[PDB]
Enzyme design. Structure first.
Site, PDB file in Angstrom:
ATOM      1  N   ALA A   4       0.826  -1.198   0.000  1.00  0.00           N
ATOM      2  CA  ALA A   4       0.000   0.000   0.000  1.00  0.00           C
ATOM      3  C   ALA A   4       0.864   1.254   0.000  1.00  0.00           C
ATOM      4  O   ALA A   4       1.933   1.296   0.616  1.00  0.00           O
ATOM      5  CB  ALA A   4      -0.926   0.002   1.216  1.00  0.00           C
ATOM      6  N   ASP A   5       0.394   2.280  -0.703  1.00  0.00           N
ATOM      7  CA  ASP A   5       1.060   3.572  -0.699  1.00  0.00           C
ATOM      8  C   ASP A   5       0.650   4.375   0.534  1.00  0.00           C
ATOM      9  O   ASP A   5      -0.295   4.029   1.249  1.00  0.00           O
ATOM     10  CB  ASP A   5       0.717   4.344  -1.974  1.00  0.00           C
ATOM     11  CG  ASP A   5       1.655   5.505  -2.226  1.00  0.00           C
ATOM     12  OD1 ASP A   5       2.706   5.581  -1.557  1.00  0.00           O
ATOM     13  OD2 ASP A   5       1.337   6.344  -3.094  1.00  0.00           O
ATOM     14  N   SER A   6       1.383   5.460   0.791  1.00  0.00           N
ATOM     15  CA  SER A   6       1.012   6.345   1.892  1.00  0.00           C
ATOM     16  C   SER A   6      -0.327   7.022   1.622  1.00  0.00           C
ATOM     17  O   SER A   6      -1.205   7.061   2.497  1.00  0.00           O
ATOM     18  CB  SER A   6       2.109   7.386   2.115  1.00  0.00           C
ATOM     19  OG  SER A   6       2.349   8.136   0.937  1.00  0.00           O
TER      20      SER A   6
END
Ligand SMILES: CCCCCCCCCCCCCCC/C=C\C(=O)N(O)CCCC[C@H](NC(=O)[C@@H]1COC(c2ccccc2O)=N1)C(=O)O[C@H](C)CC(=O)N[C@@H]1CCCCN(O)C1=O
Lengths: 722, 77
Positions: free
Chosen positions: B34-36
């Protein structure tokens, strides 16, 4: 849910396709081409209530110089000082022009008089000219016929060796502008369709979907053009080349935009896994009202031009509105119908993957930290006003047509041998119950002439007491011919032919009209002729009035279009602040389009904007920008209920690519009119194109989502949302 | 159905993760990639799944799926 009209279109799809095609063919066969109607039902350039029109009519009627607003200048040029052969040829030409009473109402023959000949001959002696007064006002079909007849007579008369003849003047220039605008229409449409086909083929990457979309757009375009041609042929509307060209381009662009919305929503529904029938019904439920709102907004915006004063704006109201009310119904009916029929055979399923990760990431970057984004884009939108102090408008229609135009070519014959004001004379007329023949009133006339000779920017005053225009008798034989052309037959009025230094038509020249009027009043004040009426006519006065009226008509059209668009969006969404934003975020963004267009034309290309550009471009910009914003806000309306802020992100994820594609197609369609011979149409198209690039790239992408995320539930007041 | 099921649903939809792939022991950044911004969007989505606003500093406690489940089972109140 399966809405009613969706079911009816779904069941009757093939009949609907064939019905619209049959209507297309019936109209194309049973009424002529729209451009042909434009040259059969064209409007007069000047407004009827202009003082510069009433003055010209009054002068013409009192001095018996015809009854029309139109005048045309015949130019004679040679490679040597004009000998007696030139005079013989000119006498033959003027005799022939007099014989054609149907068109040439009068011929102010001065070069045929040895006395006044010096007043029209070039200082070099290699050229001469004569003013003709032609039937029919500027630009009307009567004036077109008259200029064509005069041109044929001039160019059919056998010229002597080393002599050439041209025709010029506002009437010939308007006729040639019309013919050149309708000459480039085929090229405009060809380049528009070619560019769109080269573009759309890179978006869908299968030729069949592009071809069906373009066929839908073509049916829409032909139906709209055909209905407008029917109305024009019936005589219910005037027309202009601007109206025809803008209608064609707007129909093409808007039809492609509706088709793109349709296919985009259907393809997204299919990608989500819904079957053909449910996918079509979701497409209709999510795009049917968006297209209708988009159609009504553009139609009621272009219709607001009907309230303008100038005919070049007032005649764009009805034709464009009818074209857009036709192109939308065809869009809303053939689009879904052709979609469903093609869906039977599986043509419109997405070939690529409808990736939405990027736009969802942008949506979460904009919904989070909304106010900084709003400020960051408002900085960009408003810095376009920095071109406002330097903005300068140009009224010289002569420059915005190709050099090969016969009217423009004739003007070149004047520049080579005359000061650039000789072919743009301005006329001052004074009228009173007295008889001007008396010597005392002649001294009053001389005082008036001297006074106006002092006015800045005025070079020559050719009058009854100034046969050659320079400083210097009522009984002499040669002076009698001066009575025949510079005083009314009853002696109650006198006219002064006025010439400027530099272009009289430029914003510098037109302001002198008030100076001329004031100087005439001072000369006439404290004198028996003080009660004498005064009128001003010519290019200078005409375009002084045009400058006065253009500001007001632009302002009124823009405000009315803004209010109407707001009303339409309020009806569609039923949310007050929402509808306010949909159009406000575009109104604020007009500054960027204006700035970019000025920076491209005025500053970079060194070409001033024609006074038509802003009025004809702002109306389209408001409507189309509000249409994209309407699509986005209606998608918000749909997706809300999954979270006020999360719905915004999902809606951007869904409609991000659709709106980019539609915006690029529309902007490149408008930006493709630069190919037009009328550089005015090029300016209009390029202004709208730059503006809509700005909208589709910044306004709907960052301004509207940021405002929606900032306003929380107040965005939908009074709608109650948890 | 239960709270855990639909928070699982939103996590899966946000990260494109399959229903059988997501699990309590997995971490958003390492295991799920997952990205930020993905975490920010996911927390914002839970803020409307339940009417509870999460401060930015409070978003430091959302490292793994099990953490989200056990945090939001109590903070749903
Ligand atoms: C100036 C152009 C204006 C828009 C015209 C749209 C043209 C396309 C014709 C599609 C097929 C519909 C045909 C019949 C329409 C006539 C009204 C009607 O038979 N009736 O009056 C029932 C009231 C409930 C409607 C219901 N709407 C709802 O129950 C609520 C109210 O709005 C929404 C909503 C709207 C858009 C998107 C998502 C939504 O959730 N939910 C919903 O299914 O839609 C509407 C059918 C269409 C729509 O989209 N708009 C409505 C239109 C008028 C009612 C209120 N109003 O102003 C709208 O917005």
């Amino acid at each position: 849910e399966k809405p009613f009209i969706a079911r009816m279109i779904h069941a009757f799809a093939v009949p609907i396709i064939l019905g619209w095609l049959a209507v297309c063919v019936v109209v194309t066969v049973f009424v002529p081409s729209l451009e042909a109607v434009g040259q059969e039902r064209s409007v007069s350039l000047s407004p009827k209530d202009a003082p510069s029109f009433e003055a010209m009519g009054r002068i013409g009627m009192v001095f018996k110089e015809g009854d029309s607003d139109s005048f045309a200048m015949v130019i004679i040029e040679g490679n040597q000082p004009l000998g007696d052969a030139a005079h013989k040829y000119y006498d033959g030409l003027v005799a022939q022009l007099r014989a054609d009473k149907k068109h040439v109402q009068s011929v102010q023959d001065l070069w045929g008089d040895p006395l006044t000949a010096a007043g029209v001959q070039s200082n070099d002696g290699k050229a001469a000219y004569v003013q003709l007064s032609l039937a029919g006002n500027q630009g009307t079909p009567l004036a077109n016929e008259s200029v064509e007849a005069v041109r044929s007579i001039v160019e059919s008369t056998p010229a002597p060796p080393g002599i050439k003849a041209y025709v010029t003047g506002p009437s010939a220039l308007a006729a040639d502008m019309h013919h050149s605008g309708d000459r480039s229409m085929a090229r405009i449409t060809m380049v528009t369709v070619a560019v769109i086909f080269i573009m759309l083929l890179l978006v869908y990457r299968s030729i069949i979907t592009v071809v069906l979309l373009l066929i839908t757009v073509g049916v829409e375009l032909t139906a709209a053009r055909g209905v407008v041609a029917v109305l024009g042929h019936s005589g219910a509307i005037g027309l202009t080349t601007f109206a025809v060209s803008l209608l064609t381009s707007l129909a093409i662009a808007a039809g492609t935009d509706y088709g793109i919305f349709i296919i985009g929503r259907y393809q997204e529904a299919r990608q989500a896994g819904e079957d053909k029938e449910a996918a079509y019904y979701t497409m209709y439920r999510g795009t049917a009202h968006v297209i209708l709102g988009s159609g009504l907004t553009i139609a009621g915006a272009t219709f607001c031009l009907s309230f303008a004063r100038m005919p070049y704006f007032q005649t764009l109201g009805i034709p464009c509105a009818v074209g857009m009310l036709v192109a939308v119904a065809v869009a809303l009916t053939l689009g879904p119908a052709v979609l469903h029929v093609g869906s039977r055979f599986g043509l419109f399923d997405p070939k690529r993957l409808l990736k939405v990760r990027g736009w969802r990431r942008v949506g979460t970057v904009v919904v989070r930290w909304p106010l900084p984004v709003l400020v960051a884009t408002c900085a960009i939108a408003l810095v376009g006003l920095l071109a406002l102090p330097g903005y300068k408008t140009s009224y010289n229609d002569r420059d915005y047509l190709p050099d090969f135009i016969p009217a423009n070519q004739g003007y070149a014959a004047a520049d080579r041998h005359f000061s650039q004001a000789r072919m743009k004379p301005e006329i001052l007329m004074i009228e009173s119950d007295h008889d001007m023949r008396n010597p005392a009133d002649f001294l009053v006339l001389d005082k008036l002439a001297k006074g106006i000779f002092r006015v800045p920017g005025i070079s020559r005053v050719q009058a009854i007491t100034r046969p050659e225009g320079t400083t210097m008798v009522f009984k002499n034989k040669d002076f009698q011919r001066a009575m025949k052309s510079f005083l009314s037959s009853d002696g109650h009025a006198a006219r002064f032919i006025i010439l400027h230094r530099g272009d009289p038509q430029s914003p510098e020249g037109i302001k002198s009209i008030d100076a001329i009027r004031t100087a005439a009043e001072e000369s006439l004040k404290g004198t028996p002729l003080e009660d004498a009426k005064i009128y001003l006519a010519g290019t200078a006065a005409v375009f002084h009035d045009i400058s006065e009226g253009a500001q007001w008509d632009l302002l009124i059209a823009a405000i009315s279009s803004l209010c109407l668009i707001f009303i339409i969006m309020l009806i569609i969404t039923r949310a007050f602040i929402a509808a306010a934003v949909i159009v406000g975020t575009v109104a604020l963004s007009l500054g960027a389009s204006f700035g970019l267009s000025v920076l491209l034309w005025q500053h970079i290309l060194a070409i001033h904007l024609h006074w038509l550009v802003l009025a004809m471009s702002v109306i389209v910009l408001l409507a189309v920008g509000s249409d994209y914003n309407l699509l986005l806000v209606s998608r918000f309306k749909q997706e809300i209920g999954a979270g006020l802020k999360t719905g915004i992100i999902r809606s951007m994820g869904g409609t991000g690519k659709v709106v980019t594609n539609a915006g690029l197609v529309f902007a490149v369609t408008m930006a493709s009119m630069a190919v037009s011979d009328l550089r005015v149409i090029g300016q209009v198209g390029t202004t709208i194109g730059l503006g809509l690039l700005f909208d589709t790239l910044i306004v709907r992408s960052f301004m509207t989502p940021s405002i929606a995320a900032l306003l929380g539930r107040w965005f939908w007041w009074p709608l109650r949302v948890r | 159905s239960t709270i855990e099921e639909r928070v699982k649903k939103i996590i899966g939809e946000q990260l494109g993760v399959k229903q059988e792939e997501v699990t309590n022991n997995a971490s958003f950044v390492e295991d799920l990639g997952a990205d930020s911004l993905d975490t920010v969007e996911l927390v914002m989505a839970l803020e409307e799944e339940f009417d509870t606003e999460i401060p930015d500093e409070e978003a430091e406690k959302i490292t793994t799926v099990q953490a989200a489940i056990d945090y939001i089972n109590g903070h749903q109140a």
